[PDB]
C-alpha cells in the first residue's frame, strides 16, 4: 500500500501524528520542569508516551511508504519510496526521535523525562499539519489567528516551565523574584505552581511586567533576555495580525480605490450627476451582489486547458442552442466559448436601438430584456434567460436586406448579464475553420431568404 | 402590497432604526445582568426601553417578511414569494428565537434577572448589516473604520467589565485585593464607581497596561492570564486596524511619491538635463495638486462598455458635434468616435505641432490655451482657447491635397493644456463600419479644401 | 594590486573591518562609562586597540586602492583611485578616525578611553558590511531580524552605559533612582553594574517602566527623553518587523486572492463540482509543488541574451532532437527556444484529440503523455520527457492529407509541463531565415511523402 501526500488519508494521518507531537512539546516541558505531574500521574504518562511512540513508529512506517512526484506521476514501488525516504534528512530526525532514551529510566529512575526531548525532533509533522490545514480550510485568517494563539501559548507555557526550573535551581522562597516556598501549602500545590508560573510568563512575555523585580544577576539576565524575547513576540503578533487585517480587506481597499478614482474622474471631467449616481448605483450593485472582480483577469492565472474547460462548463450548452451554432464543429464551439465576453447591463439600459450597427451577438444569462417600441416604454415581447439576438448581424451575409443593422429597440428590464460574441472575435475564431464559415454564411443566408434577403 | 427595496434608502433608515435597539440590547443587557443596581433602580426605564426594542423587533420581522431580493435582475414584489423566501432562511430562526417569550421567566423571578432576555442578542446581523452598508455608503471610510473599531472594542471592554464585576460578585466583594472592593463602604458602593472602576479595570487589562492589583487566588490568576492573552490579541487588532487605516489614507500619495521617485531615478540614470527635470517634476506636481493625476484608460477600464460609452457621451459628444466635419454624422459614429478619443496633457512651451509635420492627430482643446506661434519662436497670431479644434483635414486624408496631411501651423501651449486626440487610425477604424459617413466626410473635407486651396 | 569591490575578497575585508568597528562601538562606550573594564583589563584593551588601529590603517590603504566602476568597467589606475578616494568625504572621516589622540593618554593617564571616540567615525564599513551581507545571503528576513536584534542590543548597551554615567555624575546611592552605593560589595561588582544597567535600559527603552521612579528633575528629564527615544526606536522596530512580515507572506496573500477569486467565480457561474474539484486540486498541486509564479512574468524584465542562455540551458538539447530542427542554424534555435511557451496539464487532460486544429508543437518536459485510442484508453505509445509531436502541424507543407489535423488522441498520464512552439511563433522566428524555412518545408515534405500527401 502506497499513500500519496495529496490525499485526505494523508491529512488524517497528519492529524493523528500532529496530536502526539504537540503532546510531546507541551507536556514534556511541563513534566520535565514541574516534577509533580511526573510523580503523580506516572502510569497515565507511561500509557500516553507508549501510545505516542507507537504513533511515531507508525509515522516512520508511513513516511517509508508515502508517495512523491517524479515526472508528474506518483511513485508506487516501495523500494524507491524507501530509498527516497532514507536519503532524506527527515529520516535522520525520525530515527533520532526514535532512540530508546527510556533505557536511561533504568539508571536515573523515571523522574527525569528530559531524556525524551529527542521526541521533540519531529516538529515538521506539526508544521506540515498546520500548512496543510491552512491550505485545506475555508477560514484561513481564523486558522491563522488560532495558529498564532497556539504558538504563543506554547511559548507562554515553555517560559512558565523555564521560570519554574530557574526558581527551582536558585531555590524556592530564597528571593523575592523566585517562586515562593513550596513547603507552604498555599504555594505547594501543583495548580498554584503551574498557574502562577503561567501568570509570571504572561506578565513577562507580553511586556506588562508587574512581577516582583529580580535581586540576583542570573535573574536580572533572565528577565532582560525574556523581555527582549517578549518584545520580539509582541512585534511578531502585531505584524501577523496587521498583515492579516491588510489581507482581509485588500479587496475592499482596492474596490474603494477604484470607486474613488472613478469619482475623481467624474468630478474632474464634469460628468452630469444623473450619470454620476448611475455609476455609483452600479458600484453599489457590484459590491452588494459580490460581482466585484472582473472575470477577464480572474480567469488569466489558470492554464488554457482549465480555462477552456470552465468556458465549456458555463457557456457551451448555452451556445449549442443558438440556431446558427446547432451543427457546428466541437473545437469551433470551444474557441467560441473562449471568445465570449461578459457584460452587465443596468435596468433601463438600451442593449441596442433601432438603426445601430450590429457587430455583436448577445446571449442572455441572468436577465430579462424587452423589445420596446421606438423610444417608448411599450413592449412588443419580453426575452428571458437562455435567449439570444444579433446572431445574423455578425455573420456578414452578402446581399442582406437589413445590412448589419439592429431593427429592434431592446432595453434591459432588470440587471442583465449578457455574453457578447463580437464580429471580429467570430472571424478570428473562424480563421482556422473555413468550411464552418461557409456553413455559417449559408445558414444565415437560408434564414434571411426565408424572411428577407 | 408594500415591498421595501434592500438597495433603497428607506431600508438603510430601517437599518439605523434596528441597529439602535440591537446595540442597546448588547450593551445594556450585559450591564443590567451583571450590575444589578441598574436593573433594580431604573426598572420602569428598562421596561419602556425593552417594550420599545421588542416593538422594533416585531417590526423587523415584518420588514424582513416584506423585503425584496433579486432573481433575474428584477426585484421580487409578491409578498407570498417574499414570505416563503424569508421562511426558508436561517435568519428567520434567529428572528423568532429573538422573539421567543422568555419574559415570562422575567415575570416569575421578580424582574431582577434580565439574563433571560439574552435571546434578544440574536439579532447581531442587523448591526453588521448597518455597519457594512454604512461603510459602503458614507464619505469617510477610514473615519468610520476607526469609529467601528472603537465601538467594537468598547463593546468588548464593557462586556469584560461586566464579566469582572460578576466574577468579583461571585468570589465576594472586598474579600481579596484583586476583586472589586467592599460595596458596603459608600465610596465603592456607588453604581458610578462600580461601572467606572470595572471599565477602568478592563481597559487596563484588555489593552495590556496592567496597573491593576495582582491576583491572589487561582481562579483570579486564570482569569487574568486568559484576559491578558485576549488583551494582547485586542491590542494587536487595534494596532493592525490603525496601521491599515494609515496605509489606506495615504495609499494614493505613496503611489504618486513612488512614481515621482521612479521618474527622478530615471532622469538621474539617463542624465536628463535639469531644465527638463524641473519642468517634468513641476508638471507632475501640477497634475497632483489639481486632482487630475490618474490615467483615464486605467481608471475607466473596470467600468462596462455601456457605462464607458455613456461617460464618453457625457464628456466628449457635444464638443465633438461642434467640429465642422462631424457636424452632421450618424449618432453611432459619434459614439464610436468619442470612445476613440484619447487625452494628452501639455506643459507650458510644449509644441503641439510644428509646420511640415505629418498630421495624424485631431486635437480638441479642453481646459487649456494654445497659441499659433511663428517659426522663429513665440509670436502669437491666433490664441486658441477651450472648445476650439484643429487638424481634422490632416486626418481626413483628402485625395490630391495641396497641403498633403501637413500641419501648416506651429502651435505651442501657453499654459497647461489638456487636449483630446483623435488619431487617423482611430478615425479609420471607426469609419470601417460606416462607409457612407466616410464618403460624406471625404466629400465635405474636399469641398472645404476646394473652397480654400485645391 | 587593485581590490575589486564586488569580489569575495572585498566582503572578507568588510568582515575583517566590521569586527573592530563593532568592537570600538560596544567596548569603547562601556570602557568609557564603567571605569573598571578600563582599569582592570588594561593590557587586553591596549592589545585590542593596537589591533583595531592597525586594521584601521590597513582599511585606509585598502580604500586607497579599491576599484570603482566608471563607464561599466573597473578603474585600475592607482593614482586615479587615490585621487577619487581623496576627494571623497569618507577619507575625512577615516583620517579623523586615525588621529593619534592616544598621545592624550600621556596626560590623562589611560583611565579616560573616550578620546578614542573618533574611532567610532568608521560606522560606514559596518553599514556596508550589513548591506553586503543582506545582499549576499539567502536568508534576508533572518538577517534583517538579526540586524534589528543587533541594533537593539547596541542601543540597550549604550543606554546602559549612559545610565551608569548619569548615576556616576549625580552620585551612587544618593537617590532611589540612581545605581546604588558601589562601596557595598553586593553592588560594587562590575557584573552587577553592567547587568543592572542593562536591566534598567531594557525596562526603560522598551516602555515597560518598572524601575524606581525619578526623584530629581535631571532624572525626570533623562527618563522623559529616554522613554521618548525608546518609544520612537521600538515603534520603528515593531513597524519594521510588521513590514517585513507583510512582505514575507505577500505571495501567499496574492495566491490566496487568486484562489478565492476563481472560487467565487466558479460558485457564481454555476460550474459543476467535478471541474471545481479539478481546479481546486490543480491549485493544491500548484501550491504544494512550489510552482506558483509563471515563466512569462518572471522572465519579463531580463534581456534576450540572458533569457536566451536560460532557454538554451533547458530546451536546446530537446529542440536539436527534432527531425526538422536537426540541422538548423544556431541563431534560429536561439530564437525558437525564445519562442517556447509553457503549458501545464492535469492527469487525464487531453492534449489534443483526433480532429482538432493542429497549430502548436508540444515539447514534453517533466511529464508522460499517452497516445490513447478513441473509445477507451489503450496506450499505443507512451511519450516521455524529451519527446515531441506535432511539428508537421506547424509546418503546414502544401498538399497534406492531414490538413492541420491532429490524427492522435494524446492525453496526459500525470502532470506534464509541455512547451508549445506555435505556427505563428515559428513563422515569425523564420522571418530572418528564409533558407532554413525552405529547408523546413522540404523536410516536412520529405516526411509527408514518406507517409501521406496529394500532389496539389
Amino acid at each position: 500500500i502506497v499513500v500519496d501526500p495529496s490525499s485526505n488519508l494523508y491529512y488524517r494521518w497528519l492529524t493523528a501524528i500532529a496530536l502526539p507531537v504537540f503532546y510531546n512539546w507541551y507536556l514534556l516541558i511541563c513534566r520535565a520542569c514541574f516534577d509533580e505531574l511526573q510523580s503523580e500521574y506516572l502510569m497515565l504518562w507511561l500509557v500516553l508516551d507508549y501510545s505516542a511512540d507507537v504513533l511515531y513508529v507508525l509515522d516512520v512506517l508511513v513516511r517509508a511508504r508515502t508517495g512523491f512526484l517524479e515526472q508528474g506521476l506518483m511513485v508506487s514501488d516501495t523500494n524507491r519510496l524507501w530509498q527516497h525516504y532514507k536519503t532524506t534528512t527527515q529520516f535522520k530526525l525520525d530515527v533520532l526521535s526514535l532512540v530508546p532514551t527510556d533505557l536511561a529510566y533504568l539508571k536515573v529512575g523515571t523522574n527525569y523525562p528530559e531524556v525524551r526531548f529527542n521526541r521533540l525532533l519531529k516538529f515538521s509533522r506539526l508544521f506540515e499539519f498546520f500548512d496543510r490545514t491552512e491550505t485545506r480550510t475555508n477560514y484561513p485568517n481564523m486558522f491563522r489567528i488560532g495558529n498564532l494563539v497556539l504558538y504563543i501559548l506554547i511559548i507562554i507555557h515553555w517560559n512558565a516551565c523555564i521560570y519554574f526550573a530557574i526558581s527551582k535551581f536558585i531555590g524556592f522562597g530564597t528571593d523575592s523574584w523566585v517562586y515562593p516556598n513550596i513547603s507552604i501549602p498555599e504555594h505547594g500545590r501543583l495548580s498554584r505552581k503551574y498557574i502562577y508560573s503561567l501568570y509570571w510568563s504572561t506578565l513577562t512575555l507580553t511586556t506588562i511586567g508587574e512581577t516582583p523585580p529580580p535581586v540576583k544577576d542570573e535573574e536580572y539576565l533572565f528577565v532582560v533576555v525574556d523581555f527582549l524575547v517578549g518584545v520580539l513576540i509582541f512585534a511578531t503578533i502585531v505584524g501577523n495580525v496587521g498583515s492579516m487585517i491588510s489581507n482581509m480587506n485588500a479587496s475592499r481597499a482596492e474596490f474603494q480605490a477604484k470607486i474613488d478614482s472613478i469619482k475623481q474622474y467624474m468630478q474632474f471631467r464634469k460628468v452630469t450627476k444623473d450619470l454620476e449616481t448611475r455609476v455609483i448605483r452600479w458600484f453599489d450593485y457590484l459590491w452588494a451582489n459580490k460581482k466585484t472582480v472582473d472575470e477577464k483577469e480572474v480567469l488569466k492565472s489558470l492554464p488554457d486547458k482549465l480555462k477552456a474547460e470552465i468556458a465549456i462548463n458555463v457557456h457551451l450548452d448555452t451556445l449549442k442552442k443558438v440556431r446558427i451554432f446547432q451543427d457546428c464543429e466541437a473545437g469551433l464551439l470551444v474557441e467560441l466559448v473562449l471568445k465570449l465576453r461578459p457584460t452587465v447591463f443596468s435596468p433601463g439600459d438600451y442593449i441596442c436601438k433601432k438603426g445601430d450597427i450590429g457587430k455583436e451577438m448577445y446571449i442572455i444569462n441572468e436577465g430579462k430584456l424587452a423589445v420596446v417600441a421606438d423610444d417608448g416604454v411599450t413592449q412588443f415581447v419580453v426575452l428571458s434567460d437562455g435567449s439570444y439576438f444579433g446572431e445574423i448581424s455578425i455573420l456578414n451575409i452578402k446581399g442582406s436586406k437589413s445590412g448589419n443593422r439592429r431593427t429592434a429597440n431592446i432595453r434591459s428590464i432588470g440587471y442583465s448579464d449578457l455574453f457578447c460574441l463580437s464580429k471580429d472575435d467570430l472571424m478570428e475564431a473562424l480563421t482556422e475553420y473555413p468550411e464552418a464559415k461557409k456553413a455559417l454564411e449559408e445558414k444565415g443566408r437560408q434564414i434571411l431568404m426565408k424572411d428577407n434577403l | 402590497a408594500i415591498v421595501v427595496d434592500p438597495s433603497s434608502n428607506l431600508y438603510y433608515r430601517w437599518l439605523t432604526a434596528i441597529a439602535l435597539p440591537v446595540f442597546y440590547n448588547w450593551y445594556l443587557l450585559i450591564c443590567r445582568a451583571c450590575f444589578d443596581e441598574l436593573q433594580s433602580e431604573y426598572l420602569m426605564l428598562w421596561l419602556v426601553l425593552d417594550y420599545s426594542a421588542d416593538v422594533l423587533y416585531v417590526l423587523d420581522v415584518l420588514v424582513r417578511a416584506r423585503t425584496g431580493f433579486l432573481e433575474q435582475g428584477l426585484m421580487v414584489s409578491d409578498t407570498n414569494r417574499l414570505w416563503q423566501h424569508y421562511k426558508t432562511t436561517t435568519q428567520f430562526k434567529l428572528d423568532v428565537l429573538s422573539l421567543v417569550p422568555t419574559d415570562l421567566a422575567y415575570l416569575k423571578v421578580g424582574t431582577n434577572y434580565p439574563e433571560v432576555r439574552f435571546n434578544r442578542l440574536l439579532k447581531f446581523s442587523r448591526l453588521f448589516e448597518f455597519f457594512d452598508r454604512t461603510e459602503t455608503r458614507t464619505n469617510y471610510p477610514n473615519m468610520f473604520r476607526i469609529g467601528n473599531l472603537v465601538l467594537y472594542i468598547l463593546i468588548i471592554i464593557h462586556w469584560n467589565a461586566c464579566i469582572y464585576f460578576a466574577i468579583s460578585k461571585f468570589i465576594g466583594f472586598g474579600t481579596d485585593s484583586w476583586v472589586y472592593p467592599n460595596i458596603s463602604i459608600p465610596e465603592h458602593g456607588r453604581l458610578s464607581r462600580k461601572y467606572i472602576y470595572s471599565l477602568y479595570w478592563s481597559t487596563l487589562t484588555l489593552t495590556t497596561i496592567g496597573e491593576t492589583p495582582p491576583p491572589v487566588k487561582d481562579e483570579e490568576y486564570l482569569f487574568v492570564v486568559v484576559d491578558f492573552l485576549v488583551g494582547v490579541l485586542i491590542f494587536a487588532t487595534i494596532v493592525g486596524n490603525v496601521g491599515s487605516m494609515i496605509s489606506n489614507m495615504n495609499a494614493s500619495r505613496a503611489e504618486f511619491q513612488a512614481k515621482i521617485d521612479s521618474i527622478k531615478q530615471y532622469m538621474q540614470f539617463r542624465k536628463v538635463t535639469k531644465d527638463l527635470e524641473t519642468r517634468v517634476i513641476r508638471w507632475f506636481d501640477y497634475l497632483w495638486a489639481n486632482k487630475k493625476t490618474v490615467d483615464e484608460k486605467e481608471v475607466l477600464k473596470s467600468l462596462p462598455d455601456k457605462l464607458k460609452a455613456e461617460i464618453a457621451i457625457n464628456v466628449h459628444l457635444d464638443t465633438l458635434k461642434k467640429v465642422r466635419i462631424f457636424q452632421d454624422c450618424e449618432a453611432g459614429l459619434l459614439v464610436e468616435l468619442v470612445l476613440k478619443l484619447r487625452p494628452t496633457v501639455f506643459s507650458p512651451g510644449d509644441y503641439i505641432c510644428k509646420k511640415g509635420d505629418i498630421g495624424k492627430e485631431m486635437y480638441i482643446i479642453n481646459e487649456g490655451k494654445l497659441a499659433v506661434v511663428a517659426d522663429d519662436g513665440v509670436t502669437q497670431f491666433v490664441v486658441l482657447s477651450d472648445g476650439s479644434y484643429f487638424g481634422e483635414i490632416s486626418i481626413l486624408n483628402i485625395k490630391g491635397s495641396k497641403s498633403g496631411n501637413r500641419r501648416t501651423a506651429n502651435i505651442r501651449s501657453i499654459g497647461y493644456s489638456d487636449l483630446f486626440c483623435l488619431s487617423k487610425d482611430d478615425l479609420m477604424e471607426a469609419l470601417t463600419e460606416y462607409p457612407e459617413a466616410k464618403k460624406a466626410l471625404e466629400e465635405k473635407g474636399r469641398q472645404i479644401l476646394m473652397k480654400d486651396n485645391l | 594590486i587593485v581590490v575589486d569591490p564586488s569580489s569575495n575578497l572585498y566582503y572578507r575585508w568588510l568582515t575583517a573591518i566590521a569586527l573592530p568597528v563593532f568592537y570600538n562601538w560596544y567596548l569603547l562606550i562601556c570602557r568609557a562609562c564603567f571605569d573598571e573594564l578600563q582599569s582592570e583589563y588594561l593590557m587586553l584593551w591596549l592589545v585590542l586597540d593596537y589591533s583595531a588601529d592597525v586594521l584601521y590603517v590597513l582599511d585606509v590603504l585598502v580604500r586607497a586602492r579599491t576599484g570603482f566602476l566608471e563607464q561599466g568597467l573597473m578603474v585600475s589606475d592607482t593614482n586615479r583611485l587615490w585621487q577619487h578616494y581623496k576627494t571623497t568625504t569618507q577619507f575625512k572621516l577615516d583620517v579623523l578616525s586615525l588621529v593619534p589622540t592616544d598621545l592624550a593618554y600621556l596626560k590623562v593617564g589611560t583611565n579616560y578611553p573616550e578620546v578614542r571616540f573618533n574611532r567610532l567615525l568608521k560606522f560606514s564599513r559596518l553599514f556596508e558590511f550589513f548591506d553586503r551581507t543582506e545582499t549576499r545571503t539567502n536568508y534576508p528576513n533572518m538577517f534583517r531580524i538579526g540586524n534589528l536584534v543587533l541594533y537593539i542590543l547596541i542601543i540597550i548597551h549604550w543606554n546602559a552605559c549612559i545610565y551608569f554615567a548619569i548615576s556616576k555624575f549625580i552620585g551612587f546611592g544618593t537617590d532611589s533612582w540612581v545605581y546604588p552605593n558601589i562601596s557595598i560589595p553586593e553592588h560594587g561588582r562590575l557584573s552587577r553594574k553592567y547587568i543592572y544597567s542593562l536591566y534598567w535600559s531594557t525596562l526603560t527603552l522598551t516602555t515597560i517602566g518598572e524601575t524606581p521612579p525619578p526623584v530629581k528633575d535631571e532624572e525626570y528629564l533623562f527618563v522623559v527623553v529616554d522613554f521618548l527615544v525608546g518609544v520612537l526606536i521600538f515603534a520603528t522596530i515593531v513597524g519594521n518587523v510588521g513590514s517585513m512580515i507583510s512582505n514575507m507572506n505577500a505571495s501567499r496573500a496574492e495566491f490566496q486572492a487568486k484562489i478565492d477569486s476563481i472560487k467565487q467565480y466558479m460558485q457564481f457561474r454555476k460550474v459543476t463540482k467535478d471541474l471545481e474539484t479539478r481546479v481546486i486540486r490543480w491549485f493544491d498541486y500548484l501550491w504544494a509543488n512550489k510552482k506558483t509564479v509563471d515563466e512569462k512574468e518572471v522572465l519579463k524584465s531580463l534581456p534576450d541574451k540572458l533569457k536566451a542562455e536560460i532557454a538554451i540551458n533547458v530546451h536546446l538539447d530537446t529542440l536539436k532532437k527534432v527531425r526538422i530542427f536537426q540541422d538548423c542554424e544556431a541563431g534560429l534555435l536561439v530564437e525558437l527556444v525564445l519562442k517556447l511557451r509553457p503549458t501545464v496539464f492535469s492527469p487525464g487532460d487531453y492534449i489534443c484529440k483526433k480532429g482538432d486544429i493542429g497549430k502548436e508543437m508540444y515539447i514534453i518536459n517533466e511529464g508522460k503523455l499517452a497516445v490513447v485510442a478513441d473509445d477507451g484508453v489503450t496506450q499505443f505509445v507512451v511519450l516521455s520527457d524529451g519527446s515531441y509531436f506535432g511539428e508537421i502541424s506547424i509546418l503546414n507543407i502544401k498538399g497534406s492529407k492531414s490538413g492541420n489535423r491532429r490524427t492522435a488522441n494524446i492525453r496526459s498520464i500525470g502532470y506534464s509541463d509541455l512547451f508549445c512552439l506555435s505556427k505563428d511563433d515559428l513563422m515569425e522566428a523564420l522571418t530572418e531565415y528564409p533558407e532554413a524555412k525552405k529547408a523546413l518545408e522540404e523536410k516536412g515534405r520529405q516526411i509527408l511523402m514518406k507517409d501521406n500527401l496529394i500532389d496539389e
Binding site: - | 489593552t207 513641476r282 | 527618563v223 507583510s246 534581456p303
Partner: protein, 441 residues
C-alpha cells in the same frame, strides 16, 4: 516684495512659511501653556505681549503683503497680474480661516482681563502649517525623514497638550490633595510631562487614581494613549513599507528568477550572470525596467524624455539625417534598453542582423584582428553602430565583425521589426531610407 510669488521655485516663500509656521506653533503650544500653567504672571506679561504682537504682525503681513501676491493656475495658464491674484486670495477658503484667525479678541483684555483663551482663534491658521509641510516634503529628496520628524513633533505636541490637561486636572482637584494629582514639589511642566509620557505611552508606574474624576481621566487618557501608540506604530510601518517598497519588490523578482532557475537546474555560471545583471541593474537604474515606468507616463513627457536623451545622438546618424522628425520621434519612443555584461557579444561574426545599437554609459569593442581578438575600434558612449542592418530584408544583413562589451554596456536597441512598424506610417522617410539602402548596398 515681488509683484508675484511663484510658491514653487521661491525659497523666500519657504522661509516665510517657516516664519508663519513658527508663529502658528507658538500659538498652538503656548496658548495652553499660558492658559493652564502659571507662567503668565504680571512681571512676565510684557514678553508674552511682545511675542503675541510679533506673531500677529506675522499673521497680518501674510494676509496683506505675501498671500495676495501668490501665483496660481486658473484653467491651465499661470496668472501673474496682481488684481486677479488678490481676487483669488480673497475668494479662497484660506482667507476665511485667516480673517477668522486674526479677529482681534485681544480688545477683550480690557473687560475680562488677560486670558490666553481669547487668542485661541489664532490656532485656526493650520493651512500655513500644512503648506509648509507640503513644501518641505516636496523640497526634500528623502521625505521619510521629514515624515519621522513630523510624527515625532505630533507626538511631542500631543504629550504637551496631555501635560497641560493633567496640570489642569491637578489644579481642579487641588494640588497635593490625592495621590494621583501633581504634588507641587519640583518643576510643574517637567513632572506633568513625565505623567503625560507615562500615560500616553501606557507605561504605567504612576500612582493609582483615587476619586471618580481621576479614574475617568486615567481611563480616557490610557485609551487615547493606546490609540496614539497604535498610530505611532502604524506611521512607522507605513514609512518603512513605503521607503523599502522598491528594494523588496526588486528582491522578490530576483528571488523569483533565482527560484525559476533552480527549478530547471540551470548551471551556476548562468545563474551568476543573471545575479550579476540584477546587481548592476539595481546599482545603476534602481529599478527592473524603465519600460513599465515610461508606459504609465503620458505621451508628451515620454517624448520629452526621449528627445533629451537620444535625439542628438540619432541626429548624428547619417542614415536618419534625411528623414522626417516625427518618424525619428517614434523611433525614440520605441527604443529598448538592454544591459550587456562584460564579455557579452552584442554582435557575433556571422549571426543574423536585426538591430541598431545606441551605446550609452558603456564601451563596446570591435574585435577585428587576424586571430579575432585584437580590439580594432572601441566605441564609447553616444555611438551608433549597426544602423545599416535595419534596412536589409529577409536574411539580409549578417554581422561582419565580433563586437563584445568591454565592461557593463547599457545598449539602446531599435529592432528591424519595430522600425518597419513605425515606417508603415511614414512613406516619405521610408523612401529616403530605401534609396539610401539602394545607393550604399
Amino acid at each position: 516684495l515681488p509683484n508675484s510669488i511663484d510658491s514653487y521655485t521661491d525659497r523666500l516663500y519657504l522661509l516665510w512659511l517657516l516664519l508663519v509656521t513658527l508663529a502658528y506653533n507658538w500659538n498652538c503650544c503656548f496658548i495652553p501653556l499660558r492658559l493652564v500653567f502659571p507662567y503668565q504672571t504680571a512681571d512676565n506679561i510684557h514678553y508674552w505681549l511682545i511675542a503675541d504682537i510679533i506673531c500677529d504682525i506675522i499673521y497680518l503681513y501674510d494676509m496683506l503683503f505675501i498671500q495676495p501676491r501668490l501665483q496660481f493656475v486658473r484653467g491651465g495658464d499661470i496668472i501673474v497680474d496682481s488684481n486677479e491674484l488678490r481676487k483669488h486670495y480673497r475668494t479662497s477658503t484660506k482667507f476665511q480661516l485667516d480673517v477668522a484667525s486674526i479677529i482681534p479678541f485681544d480688545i477683550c483684555y480690557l473687560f475680562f482681563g488677560f486670558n490666553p483663551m481669547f487668542r485661541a482663534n489664532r490656532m485656526l491658521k493650520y493651512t500655513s502649517f500644512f503648506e509648509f509641510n507640503h513644501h518641505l516634503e516636496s523640497i526634500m529628496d528623502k521625505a521619510y525623514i521629514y515624515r519621522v520628524i513630523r510624527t515625532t513633533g505630533y507626538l511631542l505636541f500631543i504629550l504637551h497638550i496631555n501635560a497641560c490637561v493633567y496640570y489642569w486636572a491637578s489644579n481642579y482637584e487641588g494640588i497635593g490633595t490625592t495621590r494621583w494629582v501633581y504634588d507641587g514639589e519640583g518643576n510643574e511642566y517637567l513632572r506633568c510631562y513625565y505623567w503625560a509620557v507615562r500615560t500616553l505611552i501606557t507605561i504605567g508606574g504612576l500612582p493609582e487614581p483615587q476619586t471618580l474624576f481621576e479614574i475617568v481621566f486615567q481611563l480616557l487618557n490610557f485609551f487615547s494613549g493606546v490609540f496614539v501608540f497604535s498610530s505611532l506604530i502604524g506611521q512607522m510601518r507605513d514609512v518603512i513599507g513605503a521607503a523599502t517598497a522598491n528594494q523588496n519588490y526588486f528582491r522578490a523578482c530576483m528571488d523569483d528568477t533565482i527560484a525559476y532557475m533552480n527549478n530547471y537546474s540551470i548551471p551556476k555560471l548562468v545563474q551568476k550572470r543573471v545575479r550579476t545583471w540584477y546587481e548592476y541593474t539595481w546599482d545603476s537604474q534602481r529599478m527592473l525596467d524603465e519600460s513599465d515606468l515610461l508606459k504609465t507616463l503620458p505621451t508628451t513627457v515620454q517624448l520629452a524624455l526621449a528627445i533629451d536623451v537620444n535625439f542628438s545622438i540619432i541626429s548624428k546618424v547619417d542614415l536618419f539625417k534625411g528623414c522626417d522628425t516625427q518618424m525619428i520621434y517614434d523611433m525614440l519612443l520605441r527604443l529598448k534598453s538592454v544591459l550587456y555584461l562584460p564579455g557579452d557579444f552584442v554582435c557575433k561574426k556571422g549571426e543574423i542582423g536585426k538591430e541598431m545599437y545606441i551605446i550609452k554609459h558603456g564601451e563596446v569593442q570591435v574585435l577585428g584582428g587576424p586571430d579575432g581578438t585584437k580590439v580594432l575600434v572601441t566605441l564609447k558612449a553616444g555611438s551608433v553602430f549597426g544602423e545599416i542592418s535595419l534596412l536589409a530584408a529577409g536574411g539580409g544583413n549578417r554581422r561582419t565583425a565580433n563586437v563584445v562589451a568591454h565592461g557593463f554596456a547599457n545598449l539602446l536597441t531599435l529592432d528591424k521589426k519595430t522600425l518597419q512598424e513605425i515606417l508603415v506610417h511614414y512613406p516619405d522617410s521610408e523612401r529616403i531610407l530605401m534609396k539610401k539602402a539602394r545607393v550604399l548596398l
